[PDB]
Amino acid sequence: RGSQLHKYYMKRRTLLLSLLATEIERLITWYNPLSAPELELDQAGENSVANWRSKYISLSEKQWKDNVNLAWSISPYLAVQLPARFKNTEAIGNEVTRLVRLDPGAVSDVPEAIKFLVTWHTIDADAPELSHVLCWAPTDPPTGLSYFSSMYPPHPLTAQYGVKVLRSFPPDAILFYIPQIVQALRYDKMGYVREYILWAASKSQLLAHQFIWNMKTNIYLDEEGHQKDPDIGDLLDQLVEEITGSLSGPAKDFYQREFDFFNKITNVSAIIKPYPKGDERKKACLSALSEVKVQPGCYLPSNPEAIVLDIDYKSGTPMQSKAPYLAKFKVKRCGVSELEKEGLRCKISWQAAIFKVGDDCRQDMLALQIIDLFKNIFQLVGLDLFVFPYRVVATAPGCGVIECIPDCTSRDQLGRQTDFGMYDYFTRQYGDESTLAFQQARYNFIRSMAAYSLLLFLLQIKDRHNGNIMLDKKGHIIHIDFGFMFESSPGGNLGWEPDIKLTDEMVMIMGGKMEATPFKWFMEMCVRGYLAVRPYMDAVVSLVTLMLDTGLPCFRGQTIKLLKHRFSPNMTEREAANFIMKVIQSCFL
Amino acid sequence: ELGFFLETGLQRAHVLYFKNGNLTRGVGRFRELLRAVETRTTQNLRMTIARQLAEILLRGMCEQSYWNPLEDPARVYSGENIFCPQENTEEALLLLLISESMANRDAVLSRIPEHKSDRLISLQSASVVYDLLTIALGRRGQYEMLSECLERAMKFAFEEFHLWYQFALSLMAAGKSARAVKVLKE
């Protein structure tokens, strides 16, 4: 019977042709971001591929579910990976979900296949049968944490799986995601999260310190603090009174010493407030700093991977403002586990810390977490983008400690000193544009600017004036003061400010003409970065969703929809490149 | 809302009957007790007597020592579509099934906010009823429904070796391999 084998080969030939066409289109799109008419390949092959794509893009709802059935007959892994090769049709997902529900035991690859079974219904919350998720391999922490938010109704099996996946990671990874864990208690109708928190606090040591430092601030709502939240305030009080006292021995002594030292170094800001501006305030601050002594074993809360060595008794300098000041320490870097073991028995640089009283320090944590995630993604991909994630930790209501970047140089001060464009400053600093140092500085500036512009567009950051951008010695540009984001906008949401700030001086740094080669480098770098960062939407969505009930002024209700829309999840690569190029060019002049 | 005198004065009667050895009178009294119309407030005590019957009807008689209730060895449920018991295994399985179905909805869902006694009592009751079910059903060489029942009961077990071991053994005896290997590893 030759017809059977004939059709058996024809179907597979058609499917292979479609897959090859899609892959070739993706590769050629990745080759050159712009149109690049100078670069060209074989015309006949491109025309044939385009014709085949046009032919296959017109398929109806039928004759495509049969393709999914055929792929499942070939191999379940291919069927699972099929929706990754984007097809602008919703029947593929429904058919895959039906097939995986019919037989869940055929797949055990967790990073993609779990989401086709976990949500039997998004909000309907019915049919509690055939759900056996007690065998899947562990996945990323955000996926596990997503089960405790408002996205899904509570269920014992999902909570058990979340606890199990959360209990299979090193302590540092859990330390990274501290605020989400404590915020998850709001929707935690059960007590699994509380038991996990108690177990983790009992197991390690620094995790307990981070937990207490975070939970001390979150009990109140206002900056100064006079109104406890009626939702989880009592639960937080019970948890904090339960966790303390249980510890004993050397750990208790370590905790007492650390907290006493922090209180002694913190009370100076409150003490210095009554004295007015003048040299008397400076000398009183110096005397107060000299009063405090150095206690071995202490560590900076913002840098839990270093051991303080000593304090400089002449670096005190309060700034304008609320009585904040600046401090300098001489510190040694050892590590984490070694520091943890050495704290129970008793490469050296200097650091500067800024203590702020009376201001919230929670949005900056989200901003810096997202920046760190983007940096990790870019480093893994293999591109060249430079970002500096300085650390900051809030310890008391309205009280926080902020790290200072080495060799701070504010743009506003340089502008006041010079009253000219940065091009003249760079020419004076390094020399003519024909030297190698100028070329390296330009390359570093482009590297920093591309990533920072992409981030600024993606997160919709407003209020970016000349007094916030920071310039280093090499040439990189660093942003700071991320107070306004998402929806908050000073001035009354006027909206005339562009998404990306591009003045004339920064353009003429790149040659001043749109046809200059450095500008093309910047454009292609931005396009490649935007294309590379796209497939990680779910993690960012979950991270920003889990903290919607903190009542920050930035959130207004519609953030999730706009944030998801700005990622364009139903788009092909070439269309995405066209969109990003258009939106970048629209912001120029 | 406080039943204090009827419960003792009715239960210790058949307790003394069992002590003396009047088995026929006690089993007839149980049969006529089970024929009453169900009451939502008494469901708990129902559990007890049902389980008690499952304890005695499997260890106190043989096939030839069974008799129809209509002869010696207001409204009452009747009809022709009712399921008339035929053998001890039939009615025993029926009682165990209804008891498990009614006890699944009364679970405490392992609330564990600060207290533990209620969850411990619920877990003990579930364990004993499922052990009775598996010993009753495993004798006939019917394993797959036992695997299904243990899968249904899997909700309670979080750090209990007994339930995991029983489920793994039942799955391996049924014929499935991959799930058996995974539960063995766990």
mmCIF file of C-alpha atoms in Angstrom, chain A residues 25-215:
data_model
loop_
_atom_site.group_PDB
_atom_site.id
_atom_site.type_symbol
_atom_site.label_atom_id
_atom_site.label_comp_id
_atom_site.label_asym_id
_atom_site.label_seq_id
_atom_site.Cartn_x
_atom_site.Cartn_y
_atom_site.Cartn_z
ATOM 1 C CA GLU A 25 13.505 33.798 9.059
ATOM 2 C CA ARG A 26 14.435 34.157 12.733
ATOM 3 C CA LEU A 27 18.153 33.775 11.994
ATOM 4 C CA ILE A 28 18.137 36.284 9.134
ATOM 5 C CA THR A 29 16.210 38.735 11.323
ATOM 6 C CA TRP A 30 18.848 38.348 14.041
ATOM 7 C CA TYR A 31 21.669 38.809 11.501
ATOM 8 C CA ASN A 32 21.166 42.534 10.843
ATOM 9 C CA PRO A 33 18.684 44.606 12.896
ATOM 10 C CA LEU A 34 18.190 47.386 10.360
ATOM 11 C CA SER A 35 17.195 46.866 6.732
ATOM 12 C CA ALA A 36 20.844 47.144 5.597
ATOM 13 C CA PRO A 37 20.360 47.176 1.798
ATOM 14 C CA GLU A 38 24.122 46.754 1.336
ATOM 15 C CA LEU A 39 23.976 43.264 2.857
ATOM 16 C CA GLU A 40 22.126 40.706 0.751
ATOM 17 C CA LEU A 41 21.832 36.952 0.244
ATOM 18 C CA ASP A 42 20.454 34.577 -2.394
ATOM 19 C CA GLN A 43 17.254 36.060 -3.798
ATOM 20 C CA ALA A 44 15.557 32.856 -4.978
ATOM 21 C CA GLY A 45 15.711 31.229 -1.549
ATOM 22 C CA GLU A 46 14.329 34.312 0.188
ATOM 23 C CA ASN A 47 11.502 34.584 -2.349
ATOM 24 C CA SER A 48 10.622 30.900 -1.950
ATOM 25 C CA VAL A 49 10.655 31.202 1.850
ATOM 26 C CA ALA A 50 8.414 34.277 1.705
ATOM 27 C CA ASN A 51 5.993 32.507 -0.641
ATOM 28 C CA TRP A 52 5.835 29.461 1.635
ATOM 29 C CA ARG A 53 5.260 31.666 4.686
ATOM 30 C CA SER A 54 2.431 33.477 2.903
ATOM 31 C CA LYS A 55 0.933 30.128 1.882
ATOM 32 C CA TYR A 56 1.058 28.645 5.387
ATOM 33 C CA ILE A 57 -0.035 31.787 7.275
ATOM 34 C CA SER A 58 -3.578 31.516 5.865
ATOM 35 C CA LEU A 59 -4.481 28.202 7.524
ATOM 36 C CA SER A 60 -7.824 28.114 9.330
ATOM 37 C CA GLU A 61 -8.528 26.695 12.790
ATOM 38 C CA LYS A 62 -8.754 23.217 11.272
ATOM 39 C CA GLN A 63 -5.821 21.396 9.619
ATOM 40 C CA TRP A 64 -3.687 22.843 12.436
ATOM 41 C CA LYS A 65 -4.944 20.944 15.476
ATOM 42 C CA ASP A 66 -4.219 17.848 13.391
ATOM 43 C CA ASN A 67 -0.664 19.180 13.108
ATOM 44 C CA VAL A 68 -0.494 19.286 16.912
ATOM 45 C CA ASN A 69 -1.807 15.715 17.050
ATOM 46 C CA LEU A 70 0.834 14.611 14.536
ATOM 47 C CA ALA A 71 3.583 16.356 16.514
ATOM 48 C CA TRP A 72 2.398 14.632 19.693
ATOM 49 C CA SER A 73 2.440 11.315 17.824
ATOM 50 C CA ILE A 74 6.044 12.021 16.807
ATOM 51 C CA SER A 75 7.339 13.087 20.230
ATOM 52 C CA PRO A 76 5.750 14.859 23.226
ATOM 53 C CA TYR A 77 8.778 17.144 23.622
ATOM 54 C CA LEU A 78 8.285 18.538 20.114
ATOM 55 C CA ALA A 79 4.605 19.179 20.848
ATOM 56 C CA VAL A 80 5.502 20.971 24.088
ATOM 57 C CA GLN A 81 8.115 23.127 22.338
ATOM 58 C CA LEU A 82 5.806 23.878 19.386
ATOM 59 C CA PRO A 83 4.096 26.979 20.908
ATOM 60 C CA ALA A 84 7.551 28.461 21.563
ATOM 61 C CA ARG A 85 7.851 28.864 17.790
ATOM 62 C CA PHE A 86 5.178 31.538 17.852
ATOM 63 C CA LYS A 87 2.019 30.911 15.838
ATOM 64 C CA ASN A 88 -0.575 33.699 15.966
ATOM 65 C CA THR A 89 -3.413 31.360 16.909
ATOM 66 C CA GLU A 90 -4.929 30.385 20.257
ATOM 67 C CA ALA A 91 -5.984 26.862 19.231
ATOM 68 C CA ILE A 92 -2.430 25.557 19.702
ATOM 69 C CA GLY A 93 -2.446 26.339 23.415
ATOM 70 C CA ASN A 94 -5.880 24.812 23.976
ATOM 71 C CA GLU A 95 -4.967 21.615 22.124
ATOM 72 C CA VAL A 96 -1.662 21.307 24.000
ATOM 73 C CA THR A 97 -3.463 21.812 27.316
ATOM 74 C CA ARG A 98 -6.050 19.164 26.425
ATOM 75 C CA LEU A 99 -3.360 16.671 25.403
ATOM 76 C CA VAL A 100 -1.234 17.250 28.507
ATOM 77 C CA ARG A 101 -4.325 16.915 30.708
ATOM 78 C CA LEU A 102 -5.175 13.613 29.008
ATOM 79 C CA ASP A 103 -1.745 12.212 29.963
ATOM 80 C CA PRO A 104 0.462 14.296 32.274
ATOM 81 C CA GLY A 105 3.008 11.539 32.932
ATOM 82 C CA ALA A 106 4.619 11.734 29.489
ATOM 83 C CA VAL A 107 6.431 15.019 30.259
ATOM 84 C CA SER A 108 8.757 15.932 33.123
ATOM 85 C CA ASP A 109 10.519 19.071 31.817
ATOM 86 C CA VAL A 110 9.414 21.705 34.327
ATOM 87 C CA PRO A 111 10.495 25.139 32.966
ATOM 88 C CA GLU A 112 7.762 25.186 30.302
ATOM 89 C CA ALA A 113 5.401 22.234 30.720
ATOM 90 C CA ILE A 114 4.185 23.020 34.253
ATOM 91 C CA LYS A 115 2.061 25.999 33.178
ATOM 92 C CA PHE A 116 -0.028 23.790 30.866
ATOM 93 C CA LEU A 117 -1.360 21.766 33.820
ATOM 94 C CA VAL A 118 -1.169 23.908 36.960
ATOM 95 C CA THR A 119 -4.024 26.263 36.039
ATOM 96 C CA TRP A 120 -6.935 23.922 35.425
ATOM 97 C CA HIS A 121 -8.923 27.170 35.490
ATOM 98 C CA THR A 122 -7.566 30.665 36.048
ATOM 99 C CA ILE A 123 -10.191 31.976 38.477
ATOM 100 C CA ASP A 124 -13.045 29.475 38.193
ATOM 101 C CA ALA A 125 -11.506 27.230 40.894
ATOM 102 C CA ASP A 126 -13.332 23.989 40.126
ATOM 103 C CA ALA A 127 -12.632 20.318 39.259
ATOM 104 C CA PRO A 128 -10.156 19.200 41.977
ATOM 105 C CA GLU A 129 -9.018 15.912 40.442
ATOM 106 C CA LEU A 130 -6.092 14.276 38.603
ATOM 107 C CA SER A 131 -3.750 17.029 39.873
ATOM 108 C CA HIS A 132 -0.536 15.301 40.993
ATOM 109 C CA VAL A 133 2.203 17.941 41.010
ATOM 110 C CA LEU A 134 4.191 16.251 43.812
ATOM 111 C CA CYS A 135 6.756 14.839 41.356
ATOM 112 C CA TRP A 136 7.798 17.719 39.076
ATOM 113 C CA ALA A 137 11.362 18.984 39.306
ATOM 114 C CA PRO A 138 12.043 22.301 41.069
ATOM 115 C CA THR A 139 11.649 25.497 39.048
ATOM 116 C CA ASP A 140 12.595 29.146 39.491
ATOM 117 C CA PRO A 141 11.527 30.875 42.739
ATOM 118 C CA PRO A 142 9.211 33.400 41.011
ATOM 119 C CA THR A 143 7.158 30.575 39.496
ATOM 120 C CA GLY A 144 6.685 29.037 42.936
ATOM 121 C CA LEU A 145 5.866 32.394 44.525
ATOM 122 C CA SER A 146 3.241 33.097 41.851
ATOM 123 C CA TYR A 147 0.934 30.574 43.556
ATOM 124 C CA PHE A 148 0.530 32.744 46.683
ATOM 125 C CA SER A 149 -0.616 35.914 44.892
ATOM 126 C CA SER A 150 -4.083 36.942 43.697
ATOM 127 C CA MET A 151 -3.446 35.309 40.305
ATOM 128 C CA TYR A 152 -4.592 31.876 41.477
ATOM 129 C CA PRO A 153 -7.123 30.754 44.089
ATOM 130 C CA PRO A 154 -5.600 29.021 47.127
ATOM 131 C CA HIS A 155 -5.169 25.248 47.011
ATOM 132 C CA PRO A 156 -3.229 22.917 49.346
ATOM 133 C CA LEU A 157 -1.344 21.133 46.554
ATOM 134 C CA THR A 158 -0.066 24.349 44.968
ATOM 135 C CA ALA A 159 1.069 25.704 48.341
ATOM 136 C CA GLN A 160 2.830 22.431 49.165
ATOM 137 C CA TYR A 161 4.620 22.465 45.806
ATOM 138 C CA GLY A 162 5.631 26.087 46.350
ATOM 139 C CA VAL A 163 7.092 25.316 49.769
ATOM 140 C CA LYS A 164 8.915 22.283 48.365
ATOM 141 C CA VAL A 165 10.475 24.256 45.508
ATOM 142 C CA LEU A 166 11.373 27.104 47.882
ATOM 143 C CA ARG A 167 13.151 24.671 50.232
ATOM 144 C CA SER A 168 15.739 23.534 47.649
ATOM 145 C CA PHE A 169 18.018 26.551 47.205
ATOM 146 C CA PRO A 170 21.136 27.995 48.871
ATOM 147 C CA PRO A 171 20.582 30.688 51.519
ATOM 148 C CA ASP A 172 21.876 33.558 49.356
ATOM 149 C CA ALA A 173 19.203 33.005 46.697
ATOM 150 C CA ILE A 174 16.500 33.149 49.372
ATOM 151 C CA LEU A 175 18.193 36.267 50.757
ATOM 152 C CA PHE A 176 17.776 37.908 47.347
ATOM 153 C CA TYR A 177 13.968 37.491 47.376
ATOM 154 C CA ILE A 178 13.289 38.556 50.986
ATOM 155 C CA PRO A 179 10.600 41.273 50.521
ATOM 156 C CA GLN A 180 8.334 39.107 48.362
ATOM 157 C CA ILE A 181 8.305 36.361 51.006
ATOM 158 C CA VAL A 182 7.143 38.696 53.776
ATOM 159 C CA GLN A 183 4.632 40.373 51.456
ATOM 160 C CA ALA A 184 3.185 36.961 50.541
ATOM 161 C CA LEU A 185 1.723 36.687 54.058
ATOM 162 C CA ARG A 186 -1.116 39.052 53.101
ATOM 163 C CA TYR A 187 -2.775 36.486 50.815
ATOM 164 C CA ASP A 188 -1.462 33.531 52.862
ATOM 165 C CA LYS A 189 -4.779 32.283 54.190
ATOM 166 C CA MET A 190 -2.832 29.223 55.363
ATOM 167 C CA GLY A 191 0.285 29.033 57.544
ATOM 168 C CA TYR A 192 2.770 27.250 55.293
ATOM 169 C CA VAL A 193 4.720 30.454 54.616
ATOM 170 C CA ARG A 194 4.973 31.172 58.348
ATOM 171 C CA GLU A 195 6.307 27.673 59.041
ATOM 172 C CA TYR A 196 8.842 28.006 56.223
ATOM 173 C CA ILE A 197 9.969 31.388 57.567
ATOM 174 C CA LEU A 198 10.440 29.943 61.054
ATOM 175 C CA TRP A 199 12.383 26.970 59.672
ATOM 176 C CA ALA A 200 14.640 29.191 57.551
ATOM 177 C CA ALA A 201 15.295 31.537 60.478
ATOM 178 C CA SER A 202 16.173 28.550 62.666
ATOM 179 C CA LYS A 203 18.503 27.100 60.019
ATOM 180 C CA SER A 204 20.670 30.063 58.999
ATOM 181 C CA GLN A 205 21.723 33.237 60.820
ATOM 182 C CA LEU A 206 21.941 36.246 58.484
ATOM 183 C CA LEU A 207 18.496 35.408 57.104
ATOM 184 C CA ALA A 208 17.032 36.093 60.549
ATOM 185 C CA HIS A 209 18.743 39.495 60.677
ATOM 186 C CA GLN A 210 17.429 40.416 57.232
ATOM 187 C CA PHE A 211 13.948 39.228 58.233
ATOM 188 C CA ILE A 212 13.848 41.339 61.397
ATOM 189 C CA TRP A 213 15.308 44.403 59.665
ATOM 190 C CA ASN A 214 12.703 44.182 56.901
ATOM 191 C CA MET A 215 9.733 43.396 59.157
#
